[PDB]
Amino acid sequence: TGLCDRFRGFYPVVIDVETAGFNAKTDALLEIAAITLKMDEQGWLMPDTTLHFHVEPFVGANLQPEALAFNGIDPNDPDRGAVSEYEALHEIFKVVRKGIKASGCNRAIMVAHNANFDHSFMMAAAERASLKRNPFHPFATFDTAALAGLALGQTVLSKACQTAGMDFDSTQAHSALYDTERTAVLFCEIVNRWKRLGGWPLSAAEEV
Amino acid sequence: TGLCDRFRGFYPVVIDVETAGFNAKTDALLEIAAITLKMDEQGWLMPDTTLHFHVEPFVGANLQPEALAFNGIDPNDPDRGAVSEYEALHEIFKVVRKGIKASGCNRAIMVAHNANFDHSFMMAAAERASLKRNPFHPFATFDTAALAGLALGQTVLSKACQTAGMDFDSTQAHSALYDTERTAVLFCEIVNRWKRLGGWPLSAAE
């Protein structure tokens, strides 16, 4: 019932980002949140550490007007308390390496909703910041859209959360932190329900 | 218990590709396979139609030597019976639109192992070929690597298959068709076991 036993050594970290466009290479990263997970002694999955940052657009970044209109972010607001991509990711990576070591995992895997999008932005930013020893798997993810499709028959984040019996506040949907917390709770519910119903561990089906 | 009921109107199509590199935009697509699924009257998911193609590298495509050494494909072998991207994808889309209509779904979703990779090559090929009305969802996929992580505690395709009690012949692992059918059987087993254990329908638990 160890975390390192559950996903062959993968240390799941929930991530979500807000951006200034669809291109991870050319468009600014504006917000990022991260939530590590942990298992109790019974093997139940739950949130561990939570981090969140407003991010300053990198030098040379494009800002698509439509993206800003959609997510309501204004990068030029001096009161938004933004930090550099380096500062945000350096802190996220530090927390993630420590969790990996403490739990005996060997690598982090990003958990996200339509994960590739968030993955590409995080990797692009870590590249720009010249971050060393990125604890994240280069291409593997846990896409909660697919997972929710299987478990709940829904792929839209809000609908999936509702179908899971969770709350979901539309006014907070453009916040990386809010999205990340909802996504983490969803993911945990799905993994936990699977265990509860006797799908994990694999031995359970025959016992009792 | 209809297929259209299971994934909010999404029509899952299992896809796998073999390529000549890691870059979907610049590298050739060399093989593609597709397997549509169907649900019987009791709502059990299974393979329906199977398609498979050797693909001619598009004009101006890069061929990474390492990729050819890895997958063992020789694009210049005239006996490999290759077709153009247009030919392959046009036939797949045709079969997919037909399945979508018959089952009452809205759109297809790609099912693949580490789906983004296969998705990006398929989409880039569909673009190069100027295909009309791509039935696939522009960004949503069902990644069996993540599903096998949930269902089986394994993310490697071979190991996940074996953990699921499936056979897996490594000597065939570089065939898109082979990978696609194993992936399809894995996906079906995962959806099906979820149903059998009382996870679906949502009402079943009570």
mmCIF file of C-alpha atoms in Angstrom:
data_model
loop_
_atom_site.group_PDB
_atom_site.id
_atom_site.type_symbol
_atom_site.label_atom_id
_atom_site.label_comp_id
_atom_site.label_asym_id
_atom_site.label_seq_id
_atom_site.Cartn_x
_atom_site.Cartn_y
_atom_site.Cartn_z
ATOM 1 C CA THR A 1 0.000 0.000 0.000
ATOM 2 C CA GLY A 2 2.907 2.348 -0.661
ATOM 3 C CA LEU A 3 2.692 5.243 -3.109
ATOM 4 C CA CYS A 4 5.783 3.879 -4.889
ATOM 5 C CA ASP A 5 3.961 0.570 -5.321
ATOM 6 C CA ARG A 6 0.898 2.059 -6.964
ATOM 7 C CA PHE A 7 2.313 3.361 -10.266
ATOM 8 C CA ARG A 8 5.573 1.398 -10.689
ATOM 9 C CA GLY A 9 7.694 4.072 -9.004
ATOM 10 C CA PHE A 10 5.945 7.102 -10.489
ATOM 11 C CA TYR A 11 5.350 10.031 -8.135
ATOM 12 C CA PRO A 12 2.141 11.718 -9.316
ATOM 13 C CA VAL A 13 2.009 15.508 -9.194
ATOM 14 C CA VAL A 14 -1.127 17.394 -10.192
ATOM 15 C CA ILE A 15 -0.345 20.417 -12.354
ATOM 16 C CA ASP A 16 -2.371 23.074 -14.109
ATOM 17 C CA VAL A 17 -1.393 26.235 -15.950
ATOM 18 C CA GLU A 18 -2.946 29.396 -17.303
ATOM 19 C CA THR A 19 -1.322 30.770 -20.435
ATOM 20 C CA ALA A 20 -1.408 33.547 -23.021
ATOM 21 C CA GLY A 21 -2.090 31.253 -25.992
ATOM 22 C CA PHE A 22 -2.008 27.718 -27.393
ATOM 23 C CA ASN A 23 1.694 27.525 -28.273
ATOM 24 C CA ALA A 24 3.881 26.266 -25.439
ATOM 25 C CA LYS A 25 6.994 27.415 -27.294
ATOM 26 C CA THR A 26 6.036 30.995 -28.116
ATOM 27 C CA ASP A 27 3.252 31.907 -25.670
ATOM 28 C CA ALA A 28 3.681 33.118 -22.101
ATOM 29 C CA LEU A 29 3.043 31.000 -19.033
ATOM 30 C CA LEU A 30 0.924 33.132 -16.673
ATOM 31 C CA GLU A 31 -0.009 30.845 -13.767
ATOM 32 C CA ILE A 32 1.040 27.443 -12.508
ATOM 33 C CA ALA A 33 -0.142 25.307 -9.594
ATOM 34 C CA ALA A 34 1.201 22.011 -8.276
ATOM 35 C CA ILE A 35 -0.175 19.483 -5.815
ATOM 36 C CA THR A 36 1.808 16.456 -4.680
ATOM 37 C CA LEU A 37 -0.085 13.422 -3.415
ATOM 38 C CA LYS A 38 0.437 10.908 -0.621
ATOM 39 C CA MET A 39 -0.931 7.563 0.549
ATOM 40 C CA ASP A 40 -1.948 6.745 4.100
ATOM 41 C CA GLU A 41 -1.035 3.418 5.724
ATOM 42 C CA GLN A 42 -4.194 1.859 4.263
ATOM 43 C CA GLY A 43 -3.174 2.806 0.729
ATOM 44 C CA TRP A 44 -5.704 5.599 0.212
ATOM 45 C CA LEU A 45 -4.622 8.500 -2.014
ATOM 46 C CA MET A 46 -4.845 12.182 -1.060
ATOM 47 C CA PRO A 47 -3.306 15.651 -1.595
ATOM 48 C CA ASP A 48 0.005 16.389 0.140
ATOM 49 C CA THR A 49 1.711 19.725 -0.652
ATOM 50 C CA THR A 50 0.089 22.602 -2.574
ATOM 51 C CA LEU A 51 2.020 25.297 -4.481
ATOM 52 C CA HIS A 52 0.773 28.165 -6.660
ATOM 53 C CA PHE A 53 2.265 31.083 -8.557
ATOM 54 C CA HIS A 54 1.406 33.951 -10.816
ATOM 55 C CA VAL A 55 4.094 33.903 -13.486
ATOM 56 C CA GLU A 56 5.740 36.828 -15.289
ATOM 57 C CA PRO A 57 5.730 36.456 -19.091
ATOM 58 C CA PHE A 58 9.203 35.407 -20.282
ATOM 59 C CA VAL A 59 11.193 37.960 -22.283
ATOM 60 C CA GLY A 60 10.029 37.763 -25.906
ATOM 61 C CA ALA A 61 6.769 35.945 -25.146
ATOM 62 C CA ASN A 62 3.681 36.465 -27.293
ATOM 63 C CA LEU A 63 0.408 37.396 -25.596
ATOM 64 C CA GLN A 64 -2.673 36.397 -27.567
ATOM 65 C CA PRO A 65 -5.477 38.911 -26.835
ATOM 66 C CA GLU A 66 -8.090 36.138 -27.059
ATOM 67 C CA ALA A 67 -6.288 34.090 -24.406
ATOM 68 C CA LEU A 68 -6.253 37.046 -22.016
ATOM 69 C CA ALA A 69 -9.913 37.741 -22.746
ATOM 70 C CA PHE A 70 -10.702 34.116 -22.050
ATOM 71 C CA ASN A 71 -8.832 33.665 -18.774
ATOM 72 C CA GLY A 72 -9.196 37.272 -17.637
ATOM 73 C CA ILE A 73 -5.512 37.650 -16.753
ATOM 74 C CA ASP A 74 -3.712 40.993 -17.086
ATOM 75 C CA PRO A 75 0.075 40.404 -16.967
ATOM 76 C CA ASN A 76 0.714 44.160 -16.754
ATOM 77 C CA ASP A 77 -1.011 44.508 -13.365
ATOM 78 C CA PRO A 78 1.737 45.299 -10.805
ATOM 79 C CA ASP A 79 -0.475 44.007 -7.981
ATOM 80 C CA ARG A 80 -0.673 40.422 -9.290
ATOM 81 C CA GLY A 81 2.381 39.317 -7.287
ATOM 82 C CA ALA A 82 4.071 37.510 -10.162
ATOM 83 C CA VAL A 83 7.371 35.638 -9.973
ATOM 84 C CA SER A 84 9.755 34.436 -12.668
ATOM 85 C CA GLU A 85 9.361 31.069 -14.369
ATOM 86 C CA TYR A 86 12.644 30.100 -12.735
ATOM 87 C CA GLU A 87 11.403 30.947 -9.268
ATOM 88 C CA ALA A 88 8.100 29.110 -9.653
ATOM 89 C CA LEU A 89 9.494 25.928 -11.227
ATOM 90 C CA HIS A 90 12.612 25.836 -9.056
ATOM 91 C CA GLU A 91 10.355 25.714 -5.996
ATOM 92 C CA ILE A 92 7.991 23.153 -7.527
ATOM 93 C CA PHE A 93 10.904 20.900 -8.505
ATOM 94 C CA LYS A 94 12.480 21.203 -5.052
ATOM 95 C CA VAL A 95 9.259 20.054 -3.372
ATOM 96 C CA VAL A 96 8.819 17.270 -5.925
ATOM 97 C CA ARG A 97 12.354 15.876 -5.556
ATOM 98 C CA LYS A 98 11.921 15.758 -1.792
ATOM 99 C CA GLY A 99 8.629 13.891 -2.092
ATOM 100 C CA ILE A 100 10.124 11.441 -4.560
ATOM 101 C CA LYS A 101 12.992 10.709 -2.177
ATOM 102 C CA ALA A 102 10.835 10.495 0.944
ATOM 103 C CA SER A 103 8.433 8.081 -0.765
ATOM 104 C CA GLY A 104 11.010 5.958 -2.580
ATOM 105 C CA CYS A 105 9.679 6.702 -6.052
ATOM 106 C CA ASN A 106 12.091 7.244 -8.918
ATOM 107 C CA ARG A 107 10.339 9.804 -11.088
ATOM 108 C CA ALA A 108 7.477 12.279 -11.088
ATOM 109 C CA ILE A 109 4.599 12.025 -13.541
ATOM 110 C CA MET A 110 2.322 14.946 -14.260
ATOM 111 C CA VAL A 111 -1.362 14.540 -13.564
ATOM 112 C CA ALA A 112 -3.462 17.009 -15.564
ATOM 113 C CA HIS A 113 -6.700 17.498 -17.482
ATOM 114 C CA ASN A 114 -5.943 17.076 -21.176
ATOM 115 C CA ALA A 115 -2.456 16.662 -19.765
ATOM 116 C CA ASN A 116 -0.296 17.186 -22.859
ATOM 117 C CA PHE A 117 -1.199 20.874 -22.943
ATOM 118 C CA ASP A 118 -0.039 21.475 -19.369
ATOM 119 C CA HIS A 119 2.926 19.151 -19.859
ATOM 120 C CA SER A 120 4.242 21.034 -22.898
ATOM 121 C CA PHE A 121 3.987 24.391 -21.121
ATOM 122 C CA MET A 122 5.752 23.211 -17.969
ATOM 123 C CA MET A 123 8.544 21.583 -19.964
ATOM 124 C CA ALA A 124 8.944 24.614 -22.224
ATOM 125 C CA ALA A 125 9.232 26.868 -19.171
ATOM 126 C CA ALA A 126 11.722 24.591 -17.402
ATOM 127 C CA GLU A 127 13.777 24.628 -20.586
ATOM 128 C CA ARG A 128 13.720 28.447 -20.714
ATOM 129 C CA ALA A 129 14.786 28.655 -17.077
ATOM 130 C CA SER A 130 17.687 26.254 -17.611
ATOM 131 C CA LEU A 131 16.395 24.043 -14.822
ATOM 132 C CA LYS A 132 18.591 21.044 -14.136
ATOM 133 C CA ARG A 133 17.509 17.549 -13.134
ATOM 134 C CA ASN A 134 13.844 17.947 -14.095
ATOM 135 C CA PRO A 135 12.148 15.242 -11.962
ATOM 136 C CA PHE A 136 9.302 14.872 -14.465
ATOM 137 C CA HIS A 137 8.974 12.124 -17.068
ATOM 138 C CA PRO A 138 9.779 13.597 -20.523
ATOM 139 C CA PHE A 139 6.560 12.372 -22.205
ATOM 140 C CA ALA A 140 4.421 10.282 -19.837
ATOM 141 C CA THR A 141 1.339 11.733 -18.146
ATOM 142 C CA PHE A 142 -1.862 10.819 -16.359
ATOM 143 C CA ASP A 143 -4.608 12.565 -18.303
ATOM 144 C CA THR A 144 -7.619 13.017 -15.997
ATOM 145 C CA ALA A 145 -9.826 13.619 -19.033
ATOM 146 C CA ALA A 146 -9.212 10.041 -20.151
ATOM 147 C CA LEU A 147 -9.377 8.712 -16.571
ATOM 148 C CA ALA A 148 -12.701 10.484 -15.975
ATOM 149 C CA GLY A 149 -13.963 9.150 -19.291
ATOM 150 C CA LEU A 150 -13.343 5.647 -17.981
ATOM 151 C CA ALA A 151 -14.511 6.130 -14.396
ATOM 152 C CA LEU A 152 -17.339 8.652 -14.789
ATOM 153 C CA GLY A 153 -18.244 8.676 -18.485
ATOM 154 C CA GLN A 154 -17.315 12.373 -18.692
ATOM 155 C CA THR A 155 -14.308 14.231 -20.142
ATOM 156 C CA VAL A 156 -15.121 17.862 -19.350
ATOM 157 C CA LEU A 157 -13.502 18.797 -16.033
ATOM 158 C CA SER A 158 -16.531 20.498 -14.466
ATOM 159 C CA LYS A 159 -19.006 17.807 -15.537
ATOM 160 C CA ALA A 160 -16.645 15.076 -14.349
ATOM 161 C CA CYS A 161 -16.320 16.732 -10.929
ATOM 162 C CA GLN A 162 -20.071 17.119 -10.627
ATOM 163 C CA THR A 163 -20.652 13.523 -11.731
ATOM 164 C CA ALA A 164 -18.127 12.590 -9.025
ATOM 165 C CA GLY A 165 -20.303 14.353 -6.455
ATOM 166 C CA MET A 166 -17.850 17.231 -6.131
ATOM 167 C CA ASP A 167 -18.524 20.956 -6.050
ATOM 168 C CA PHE A 168 -17.385 23.096 -8.965
ATOM 169 C CA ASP A 169 -17.545 26.889 -9.022
ATOM 170 C CA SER A 170 -17.526 28.353 -12.541
ATOM 171 C CA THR A 171 -16.285 31.732 -11.320
ATOM 172 C CA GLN A 172 -12.994 30.101 -10.308
ATOM 173 C CA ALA A 173 -12.397 28.066 -13.461
ATOM 174 C CA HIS A 174 -9.688 30.372 -14.820
ATOM 175 C CA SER A 175 -7.517 29.923 -11.732
ATOM 176 C CA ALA A 176 -4.659 27.431 -12.007
ATOM 177 C CA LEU A 177 -4.817 26.787 -8.266
ATOM 178 C CA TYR A 178 -8.554 26.128 -8.224
ATOM 179 C CA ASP A 179 -8.345 23.878 -11.294
ATOM 180 C CA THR A 180 -5.381 22.014 -9.836
ATOM 181 C CA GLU A 181 -7.147 21.364 -6.534
ATOM 182 C CA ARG A 182 -10.329 20.160 -8.227
ATOM 183 C CA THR A 183 -8.249 17.988 -10.565
ATOM 184 C CA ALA A 184 -6.297 16.496 -7.635
ATOM 185 C CA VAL A 185 -9.497 15.676 -5.750
ATOM 186 C CA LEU A 186 -11.008 14.148 -8.896
ATOM 187 C CA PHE A 187 -7.921 12.042 -9.563
ATOM 188 C CA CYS A 188 -7.859 10.859 -5.947
ATOM 189 C CA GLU A 189 -11.551 9.943 -6.050
ATOM 190 C CA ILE A 190 -11.012 7.883 -9.189
ATOM 191 C CA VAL A 191 -7.992 5.991 -7.869
ATOM 192 C CA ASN A 192 -9.705 5.499 -4.504
ATOM 193 C CA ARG A 193 -13.025 4.344 -5.946
ATOM 194 C CA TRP A 194 -11.141 1.781 -8.024
ATOM 195 C CA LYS A 195 -9.530 0.375 -4.863
ATOM 196 C CA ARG A 196 -12.753 0.587 -2.846
ATOM 197 C CA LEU A 197 -14.628 -1.431 -5.485
ATOM 198 C CA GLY A 198 -11.950 -4.124 -5.316
ATOM 199 C CA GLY A 199 -10.005 -3.424 -8.494
ATOM 200 C CA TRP A 200 -6.835 -2.735 -6.547
ATOM 201 C CA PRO A 201 -4.713 -4.323 -5.532
ATOM 202 C CA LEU A 202 -5.002 -6.980 -8.235
ATOM 203 C CA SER A 203 -5.308 -9.707 -5.590
ATOM 204 C CA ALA A 204 -8.484 -8.191 -4.140
ATOM 205 C CA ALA A 205 -10.937 -9.593 -6.703
ATOM 206 C CA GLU A 206 -10.400 -13.137 -5.398
ATOM 207 C CA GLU A 207 -10.271 -12.350 -1.693
ATOM 208 C CA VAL A 208 -13.591 -12.531 0.177
ATOM 209 C CA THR B 1 -25.671 0.345 -22.721
ATOM 210 C CA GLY B 2 -25.012 1.966 -26.106
ATOM 211 C CA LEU B 3 -21.516 3.014 -27.185
ATOM 212 C CA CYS B 4 -22.723 6.607 -27.579
ATOM 213 C CA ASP B 5 -23.831 6.547 -23.942
ATOM 214 C CA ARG B 6 -20.469 5.475 -22.552
ATOM 215 C CA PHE B 7 -18.151 8.390 -23.363
ATOM 216 C CA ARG B 8 -20.528 11.372 -23.711
ATOM 217 C CA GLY B 9 -20.889 10.780 -27.443
ATOM 218 C CA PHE B 10 -17.245 10.032 -28.201
ATOM 219 C CA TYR B 11 -16.459 7.266 -30.693
ATOM 220 C CA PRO B 12 -13.187 5.630 -29.585
ATOM 221 C CA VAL B 13 -10.826 4.579 -32.351
ATOM 222 C CA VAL B 14 -7.616 2.772 -31.444
ATOM 223 C CA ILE B 15 -4.622 4.121 -33.344
ATOM 224 C CA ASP B 16 -0.917 3.387 -33.525
ATOM 225 C CA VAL B 17 1.836 4.663 -35.811
ATOM 226 C CA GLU B 18 5.394 3.853 -36.746
ATOM 227 C CA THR B 19 7.510 6.820 -37.764
ATOM 228 C CA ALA B 20 10.971 7.896 -38.877
ATOM 229 C CA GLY B 21 11.621 10.197 -35.911
ATOM 230 C CA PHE B 22 10.223 12.044 -32.904
ATOM 231 C CA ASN B 23 8.964 15.154 -34.739
ATOM 232 C CA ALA B 24 5.399 14.923 -36.058
ATOM 233 C CA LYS B 25 5.859 17.959 -38.300
ATOM 234 C CA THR B 26 9.177 17.079 -39.930
ATOM 235 C CA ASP B 27 9.478 13.296 -39.738
ATOM 236 C CA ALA B 28 7.822 10.738 -41.992
ATOM 237 C CA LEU B 29 4.839 8.653 -40.996
ATOM 238 C CA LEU B 30 5.706 5.080 -42.021
ATOM 239 C CA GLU B 31 2.837 2.897 -40.761
ATOM 240 C CA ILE B 32 -0.631 3.495 -39.364
ATOM 241 C CA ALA B 33 -3.294 1.154 -37.977
ATOM 242 C CA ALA B 34 -6.818 1.865 -36.760
ATOM 243 C CA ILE B 35 -9.359 -0.231 -34.906
ATOM 244 C CA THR B 36 -12.886 0.976 -34.241
ATOM 245 C CA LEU B 37 -14.743 -0.516 -31.304
ATOM 246 C CA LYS B 38 -18.346 -1.551 -30.721
ATOM 247 C CA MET B 39 -20.601 -2.360 -27.779
ATOM 248 C CA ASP B 40 -22.858 -5.391 -27.814
ATOM 249 C CA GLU B 41 -26.423 -5.320 -26.465
ATOM 250 C CA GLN B 42 -25.215 -5.823 -22.879
ATOM 251 C CA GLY B 43 -22.807 -2.913 -23.209
ATOM 252 C CA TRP B 44 -19.561 -4.873 -23.426
ATOM 253 C CA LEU B 45 -16.864 -3.203 -25.515
ATOM 254 C CA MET B 46 -15.010 -5.033 -28.293
ATOM 255 C CA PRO B 47 -13.021 -4.521 -31.517
ATOM 256 C CA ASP B 48 -15.102 -3.803 -34.624
ATOM 257 C CA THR B 49 -13.268 -2.835 -37.842
ATOM 258 C CA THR B 50 -9.493 -3.113 -38.351
ATOM 259 C CA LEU B 51 -7.450 -1.073 -40.857
ATOM 260 C CA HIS B 52 -3.691 -1.075 -41.471
ATOM 261 C CA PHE B 53 -1.302 0.663 -43.851
ATOM 262 C CA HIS B 54 2.311 1.080 -44.819
ATOM 263 C CA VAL B 55 2.793 4.776 -45.521
ATOM 264 C CA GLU B 56 5.016 6.436 -48.124
ATOM 265 C CA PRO B 57 7.170 9.186 -46.588
ATOM 266 C CA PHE B 58 5.721 12.568 -47.610
ATOM 267 C CA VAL B 59 7.700 14.722 -50.035
ATOM 268 C CA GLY B 60 10.455 16.529 -48.120
ATOM 269 C CA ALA B 61 10.165 14.347 -45.002
ATOM 270 C CA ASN B 62 13.145 13.694 -42.731
ATOM 271 C CA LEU B 63 14.167 10.097 -42.029
ATOM 272 C CA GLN B 64 16.150 9.704 -38.818
ATOM 273 C CA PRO B 65 18.536 6.728 -39.224
ATOM 274 C CA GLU B 66 18.174 5.867 -35.517
ATOM 275 C CA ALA B 67 14.398 5.584 -35.897
ATOM 276 C CA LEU B 68 14.715 3.247 -38.894
ATOM 277 C CA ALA B 69 17.204 1.119 -36.971
ATOM 278 C CA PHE B 70 14.819 0.994 -34.027
ATOM 279 C CA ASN B 71 11.651 0.027 -35.896
ATOM 280 C CA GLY B 72 13.382 -1.852 -38.705
ATOM 281 C CA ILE B 73 11.495 -0.200 -41.567
ATOM 282 C CA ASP B 74 13.052 0.366 -44.994
ATOM 283 C CA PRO B 75 10.926 3.001 -46.797
ATOM 284 C CA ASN B 76 12.820 2.347 -50.030
ATOM 285 C CA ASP B 77 11.850 -1.333 -50.219
ATOM 286 C CA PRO B 78 9.431 -1.408 -53.187
ATOM 287 C CA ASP B 79 7.810 -4.574 -51.821
ATOM 288 C CA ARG B 80 6.464 -2.965 -48.637
ATOM 289 C CA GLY B 81 3.282 -2.023 -50.517
ATOM 290 C CA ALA B 82 3.042 1.544 -49.247
ATOM 291 C CA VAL B 83 0.232 4.018 -49.912
ATOM 292 C CA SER B 84 0.161 7.804 -49.596
ATOM 293 C CA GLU B 85 -0.956 9.558 -46.418
ATOM 294 C CA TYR B 86 -4.065 10.695 -48.266
ATOM 295 C CA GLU B 87 -4.986 7.136 -49.229
ATOM 296 C CA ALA B 88 -4.459 5.737 -45.746
ATOM 297 C CA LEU B 89 -6.110 8.515 -43.762
ATOM 298 C CA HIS B 90 -8.978 9.019 -46.221
ATOM 299 C CA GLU B 91 -9.916 5.348 -45.845
ATOM 300 C CA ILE B 92 -9.676 5.506 -42.051
ATOM 301 C CA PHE B 93 -11.779 8.658 -41.820
ATOM 302 C CA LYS B 94 -14.369 7.091 -44.120
ATOM 303 C CA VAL B 95 -14.674 4.027 -41.889
ATOM 304 C CA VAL B 96 -14.734 6.253 -38.806
ATOM 305 C CA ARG B 97 -17.481 8.628 -39.989
ATOM 306 C CA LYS B 98 -19.588 5.583 -40.852
ATOM 307 C CA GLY B 99 -19.130 4.102 -37.382
ATOM 308 C CA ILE B 100 -19.904 7.431 -35.740
ATOM 309 C CA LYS B 101 -23.162 7.782 -37.652
ATOM 310 C CA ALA B 102 -24.335 4.203 -37.139
ATOM 311 C CA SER B 103 -23.729 4.357 -33.381
ATOM 312 C CA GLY B 104 -25.106 7.871 -32.901
ATOM 313 C CA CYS B 105 -21.888 9.382 -31.563
ATOM 314 C CA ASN B 106 -20.776 12.976 -32.152
ATOM 315 C CA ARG B 107 -17.035 12.740 -32.720
ATOM 316 C CA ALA B 108 -14.198 10.235 -32.656
ATOM 317 C CA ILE B 109 -11.564 10.205 -29.956
ATOM 318 C CA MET B 110 -8.201 8.581 -30.477
ATOM 319 C CA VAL B 111 -7.258 5.735 -28.158
ATOM 320 C CA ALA B 112 -3.496 5.226 -28.040
ATOM 321 C CA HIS B 113 -0.604 4.355 -25.751
ATOM 322 C CA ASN B 114 1.083 7.622 -24.837
ATOM 323 C CA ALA B 115 -1.626 9.006 -27.092
ATOM 324 C CA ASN B 116 -0.223 12.471 -27.742
ATOM 325 C CA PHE B 117 2.570 11.030 -29.852
ATOM 326 C CA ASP B 118 0.281 9.061 -32.171
ATOM 327 C CA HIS B 119 -2.266 11.873 -32.195
ATOM 328 C CA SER B 120 0.278 14.489 -33.297
ATOM 329 C CA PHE B 121 1.502 12.323 -36.186
ATOM 330 C CA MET B 122 -2.007 11.477 -37.352
ATOM 331 C CA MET B 123 -3.115 15.109 -37.176
ATOM 332 C CA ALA B 124 -0.006 16.379 -38.944
ATOM 333 C CA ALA B 125 -0.495 13.781 -41.699
ATOM 334 C CA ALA B 126 -4.180 14.700 -42.050
ATOM 335 C CA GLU B 127 -3.058 18.301 -42.524
ATOM 336 C CA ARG B 128 -0.388 17.555 -45.118
ATOM 337 C CA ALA B 129 -3.029 15.597 -47.028
ATOM 338 C CA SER B 130 -5.623 18.394 -46.923
ATOM 339 C CA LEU B 131 -8.299 16.066 -45.555
ATOM 340 C CA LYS B 132 -11.796 17.480 -45.128
ATOM 341 C CA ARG B 133 -13.818 17.262 -41.914
ATOM 342 C CA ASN B 134 -11.433 15.299 -39.697
ATOM 343 C CA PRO B 135 -13.762 13.275 -37.448
ATOM 344 C CA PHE B 136 -11.225 13.135 -34.611
ATOM 345 C CA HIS B 137 -11.223 15.458 -31.617
ATOM 346 C CA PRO B 138 -8.550 18.188 -32.076
ATOM 347 C CA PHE B 139 -6.872 17.590 -28.679
ATOM 348 C CA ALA B 140 -8.737 15.074 -26.496
ATOM 349 C CA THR B 141 -7.397 11.510 -26.326
ATOM 350 C CA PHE B 142 -7.692 8.355 -24.268
ATOM 351 C CA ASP B 143 -4.125 7.484 -23.266
ATOM 352 C CA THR B 144 -3.958 3.765 -22.393
ATOM 353 C CA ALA B 145 -0.686 4.408 -20.560
ATOM 354 C CA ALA B 146 -2.654 6.406 -17.989
ATOM 355 C CA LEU B 147 -5.597 3.975 -17.976
ATOM 356 C CA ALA B 148 -3.275 1.004 -17.439
ATOM 357 C CA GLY B 149 -1.654 3.002 -14.651
ATOM 358 C CA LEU B 150 -5.062 3.247 -13.009
ATOM 359 C CA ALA B 151 -6.338 -0.230 -13.812
ATOM 360 C CA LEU B 152 -3.171 -2.323 -13.659
ATOM 361 C CA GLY B 153 -0.506 -0.261 -11.900
ATOM 362 C CA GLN B 154 1.623 -0.472 -15.060
ATOM 363 C CA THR B 155 2.344 2.078 -17.804
ATOM 364 C CA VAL B 156 4.572 0.135 -20.209
ATOM 365 C CA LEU B 157 2.426 -1.418 -22.960
ATOM 366 C CA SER B 158 4.035 -4.867 -22.855
ATOM 367 C CA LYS B 159 3.914 -5.125 -19.042
ATOM 368 C CA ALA B 160 0.392 -3.726 -18.804
ATOM 369 C CA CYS B 161 -0.745 -6.328 -21.334
ATOM 370 C CA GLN B 162 0.926 -9.155 -19.430
ATOM 371 C CA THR B 163 -0.434 -7.898 -16.103
ATOM 372 C CA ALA B 164 -3.861 -7.967 -17.777
ATOM 373 C CA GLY B 165 -3.286 -11.645 -18.604
ATOM 374 C CA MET B 166 -2.780 -10.942 -22.301
ATOM 375 C CA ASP B 167 -0.093 -12.453 -24.499
ATOM 376 C CA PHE B 168 2.543 -10.107 -25.905
ATOM 377 C CA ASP B 169 5.072 -11.062 -28.597
ATOM 378 C CA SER B 170 8.023 -8.653 -28.505
ATOM 379 C CA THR B 171 9.171 -9.691 -31.974
ATOM 380 C CA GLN B 172 6.053 -7.954 -33.317
ATOM 381 C CA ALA B 173 6.268 -4.815 -31.180
ATOM 382 C CA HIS B 174 7.447 -2.634 -34.066
ATOM 383 C CA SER B 175 4.318 -3.292 -36.094
ATOM 384 C CA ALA B 176 1.667 -0.586 -35.874
ATOM 385 C CA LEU B 177 -1.010 -3.190 -36.574
ATOM 386 C CA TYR B 178 0.199 -5.486 -33.800
ATOM 387 C CA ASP B 179 0.551 -2.651 -31.274
ATOM 388 C CA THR B 180 -2.903 -1.380 -32.252
ATOM 389 C CA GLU B 181 -4.705 -4.687 -31.697
ATOM 390 C CA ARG B 182 -2.963 -5.319 -28.370
ATOM 391 C CA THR B 183 -3.809 -1.760 -27.322
ATOM 392 C CA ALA B 184 -7.430 -2.248 -28.408
ATOM 393 C CA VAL B 185 -7.759 -5.484 -26.434
ATOM 394 C CA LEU B 186 -6.152 -3.814 -23.406
ATOM 395 C CA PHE B 187 -8.484 -0.817 -23.572
ATOM 396 C CA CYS B 188 -11.506 -3.111 -23.906
ATOM 397 C CA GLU B 189 -10.377 -5.262 -20.996
ATOM 398 C CA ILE B 190 -9.992 -2.147 -18.841
ATOM 399 C CA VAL B 191 -13.374 -0.684 -19.726
ATOM 400 C CA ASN B 192 -14.998 -4.120 -19.388
ATOM 401 C CA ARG B 193 -13.485 -5.001 -16.012
ATOM 402 C CA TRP B 194 -14.567 -1.606 -14.695
ATOM 403 C CA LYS B 195 -18.117 -2.523 -15.684
ATOM 404 C CA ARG B 196 -17.976 -6.044 -14.294
ATOM 405 C CA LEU B 197 -16.633 -4.861 -10.922
ATOM 406 C CA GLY B 198 -19.652 -2.578 -10.568
ATOM 407 C CA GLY B 199 -18.049 0.722 -11.533
ATOM 408 C CA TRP B 200 -20.320 1.247 -14.516
ATOM 409 C CA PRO B 201 -23.107 2.179 -14.941
ATOM 410 C CA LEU B 202 -22.818 4.729 -12.124
ATOM 411 C CA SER B 203 -26.125 3.334 -10.835
ATOM 412 C CA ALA B 204 -24.758 -0.212 -10.613
ATOM 413 C CA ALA B 205 -22.971 0.192 -7.257
ATOM 414 C CA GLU B 206 -26.353 0.366 -5.472
#
